[PDB]
Design a protein around this ligand. Structure first.
Ligand SMILES: Nc1ncnc2c1ncn2[C@@H]1O[C@@H]2COP(=O)(O)O[C@H]2[C@H]1O
Ligand SMILES: Nc1ncnc2c1ncn2[C@@H]1O[C@@H]2COP(=O)(O)O[C@H]2[C@H]1O
Lengths: 173, 170
């Protein structure tokens, strides 16, 4: 079936195994891509890292848009759905970004993509926010399940662990 | 959203094992995290974690509960030696209901400890497709769910120990 419990627990217990398998940031980022693709195959999704010093978010991963167009983007805290996730430390689901004042058009203006829906989750490790993962125009009010949310939160949890350790390993070297 | 089934809780449970075990880069904390999870899920009076040294192709003990560590500190198992050594070679779990009827069994440790081994469940610690060690539950049936939990502990412990080694080189 793959809906049977034995298959579900195999799948759920595989989470994190690719993501946590390297200390080097590039390999972590590739691994995150692999697990996100496996569970969601999103045409548009991203991972934004939070810089504690500048209090800004920047892109590390941005699938379905041109990385060159968004390399220079920095979001201030509270800016965008992604910025609000950092502040609230909680997920945000938005069925239509026009109807949300928190939304930031900045990136759509650079890319010419039109954002309609966002699920955004915080990456938290030991109480610190390391960033945000967004799935863009992937889900709407009907298709977004509690299981989807938990799977995505779990990916974000393991990614936080791996990125924290990658940073700490870089320092000592 | 309103909940229709227990999937969210299943995901949180199965993925908690790896979040706990991988959270530290210091070996002692990793080992303590492993002990915590193994004790919680299985409460074994006798169990162990043996690390595989790629260079010497030997297994040695990092954890050995229910026997005196001072008796087994020097033990080294060659590849293929013991149930544990066979797991390394086959890269698969081995269940043995009675070690007297298994030619793979190694008496070497019982001889040092004076403990009598009767049953073993042994699981490989897999990292990037290779075996980095073995976890044994000794003298105490084993459901498919138990197996998955143990295998998950094993795999994440390989991941976490590899990183702890790489980090501690500094
Ligand atoms: N992979 C992506 N493809 C297209 N647009 C994206 C992607 N990731 C982020 N965005 C957009 O970037 C915006 C950043 O601020 P918001 O989170 O408020 O809304 C976000 C989306 O509109
Ligand atoms: N925690 C333990 N308590 C007692 N004996 C153990 C423990 N862990 C491993 N052993 C023994 O160590 C032996 C190593 O070789 P085997 O795997 O064939 O069989 C193993 C057991 O007999």
């Amino acid at each position: 079936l793959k809906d049977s419990k034995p298959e579900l627990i195999k799948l759920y217990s595989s989470l994190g195994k690719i993501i946590t398998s390297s200390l080097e940031q590039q390999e972590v980022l590739s691994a995150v891509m692999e697990e996100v693709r496996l569970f969601f195959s999103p045409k548009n999704w991203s991972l934004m890292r939070y810089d504690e010093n500048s209090e800004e978010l920047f892109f590390l991963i941005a699938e379905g848009i041109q990385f060159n167009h968004i390399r220079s983007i920095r979001l201030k805290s509270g800016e965008g759905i992604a910025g609000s996730v950092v502040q609230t430390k909680s997920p945000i689901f938005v069925e239509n970004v026009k109807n949300d004042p928190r939304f930031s058009k900045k990136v759509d203006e650079k890319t010419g993509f039109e954002t309609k829906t966002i699920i955004a989750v915080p990456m938290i490790f030991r109480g610190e926010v390391h960033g945000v993962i967004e799935l863009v125009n992937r889900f709407d009010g009907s298709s977004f399940s509690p299981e989807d949310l938990v799977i995505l939160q779990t990916i974000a949890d393991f990614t936080a662990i791996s990125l924290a350790h990658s940073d700490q390993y870089e320092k000592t070297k």
